[PDB]
From a paper:
BeF3− is a close chemical mimetic of phosphate that has been employed in mechanistic studies of G-proteins and tubulin as a reversibly binding analog of the GTP γ-phosphate, whose interaction with FtsZ has not been documented. An intricate network of solvent molecules surrounds BeF3− and Mg2+ ions and contributes to stabilize the interactions between adjacent monomers. The last two solvent molecules belong to an H-bond connected path where three additional waters (B3 to B5) bridge bottom residue R143 with the GDP α-phosphate and the backbone of top residues M292 and F294. This solvent shell is altered in a structure lacking Mg2+, where bridging waters B2 to B4 shift away from R143 by approximately 1 Å and BeF3− tilts away from the precatalytic water by 6°, likely weakening BeF3− binding. Moreover, relocation of waters B2 to B4 upon Mg2+ binding enables bridging of R143 with the nucleotide phosphates, which arises as a key event to position its positive charge to assist catalysis.
FtsZ is an assembling GTPase that plays a key role during bacterial cell division. This widely conserved protein polymerizes in the presence of GTP and metal cations into polar filaments that gather at the center of dividing cells to form a dynamic Z-ring. First, GTP hydrolysis only occurs within the filament, as the complete catalytic site is formed at the interface between adjacent FtsZ monomers. We report a dozen filament structures of the FtsZ core (residues 12 to 316) from the pathogen S. aureus, hereafter SaFtsZ, in complex with various GTP mimetics and metal ions.
Author numbering: 9 to 315
The structure:
């Protein structure tokens, strides 16, 4: 019997913000690691493992938007990063691309994690257009470096947040919406691993779908009542915040959780939604959990890769 060790690693300011907000939100059986050059921001981290990188280079400051300093800082702290990762079966590396630390250090952190054997997933943002062309170009280089270092990558263009706010939505509320991409992906895997399903999925299936597979989608949908299975499946695949949609997916890990009322017909309807939206011929791994504590709720979890 196997129990996978999951770690979430924030790199740079945005990544550590995500870690802090996810710790605040509550999340267990997940080890959080905060990595930064910025000692002022790192001192306020709620993570149990904090690694200040690059102190001999930045004198305790951030990288001043220079990704070469973020990269050199992580390289110089390799053994501390290894020590913190050690034991991980899966590592999520979260970072905002475009600055100095995330852009340069997050690909090194991901490469270390993957070299150490962990299934390594990146979840990174691209800068808002209002931050300018140079920030966007630097971020794009970071994204390319992340792609080369991870098993699977989820990119959230921050400009998508402007599609989900009104003119008054607090910035911090918008940032929480972006955090949900990572939080729900992590929670989805943690739950899939921990619960025994009637058609049981496990971390070996996660590895098959996600190891060395490029772009990825991780989503969860919940619905009740009539058409619940179709609606939950549509929710799981339809986030407005992703660069990579479901269209073209080559591999899918799909789990449906419901109460004793979960019907075979509605499980097919949900699977068909995912198949059809993909518009592809796919390696689908389908699972089912019966949670008798549920009444009318259905939960669909999707991991899609291979575009
Ligand atoms: N969605 C989101 N984006 C962020 C957050 N913090 C920073 N960013 C974005 O991340 C980019 C890099 O900023 P930051 O992580 O502070 O730079 P670093 O510390 O030098 O890596 C910024 O240009 C923003 O686009 C955050 O909390 N949420
Ligand atoms: F704030 Be980052 F380190 F440029
Ligand atoms: K399981």
């Amino acid at each position: 019997s196997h129990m996978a060790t999951l770690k979430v690693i924030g790199v740079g300011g945005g990544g550590n913000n995500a870690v802090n907000r996810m710790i605040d939100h509550g999340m267990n059986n997940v080890e959080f690691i905060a990595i930064n050059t910025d000692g002022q921001a790192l001192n306020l981290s709620k993570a149990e493992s904090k690694i200040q990188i690059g102190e001999k280079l930045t004198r305790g400051l951030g990288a001043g938007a220079n990704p070469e300093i973020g990269k050199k800082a992580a390289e110089e702290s390799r053994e501390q990063i290894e020590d913190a990762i050690q034991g991980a079966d899966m590592v999520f590396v979260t970072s905002g691309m475009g600055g100095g630390t995330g852009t340069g250090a997050a690909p090194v952190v991901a490469k270390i994690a993957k070299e150490m054997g962990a299934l390594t997933v990146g979840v990174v943002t691209r800068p808002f257009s209002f931050e300018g062309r140079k920030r966007q170009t630097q971020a794009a280089a970071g994204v390319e470096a992340m792609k080369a270092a991870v098993d699977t990558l989820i990119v959230i263009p921050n400009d998508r947040l402007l599609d989900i706010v009104d003119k008054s939505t607090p910035m911090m509320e918008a940032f929480k919406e972006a955090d949900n991409v990572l939080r729900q992906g992590v929670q989805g895997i943690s739950d899939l691993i921990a619960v025994s399903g009637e058609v049981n999925l496990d971390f070996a299936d996660v590895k098959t779908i996600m190891s060395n597979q490029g772009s990825a989608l991780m989503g969860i949908g919940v619905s009740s009542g009539e058409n619940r299975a179709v609606e939950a499946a549509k929710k799981a695949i339809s986030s407005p915040l992703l660069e990579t949609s479901i269209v073209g997916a080559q591999g899918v890990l799909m789990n449906i959780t419901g109460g004793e009322s979960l019907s075979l017909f509605e499980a097919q309807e949900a699977a068909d939604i995912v198949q059809d939206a993909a518009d592809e011929d796919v390696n689908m791994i389908f699972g089912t959990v019966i949670n008798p504590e549920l009444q009318d709720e259905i939960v669909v979890t999707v991991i899609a890769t291979g575009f």
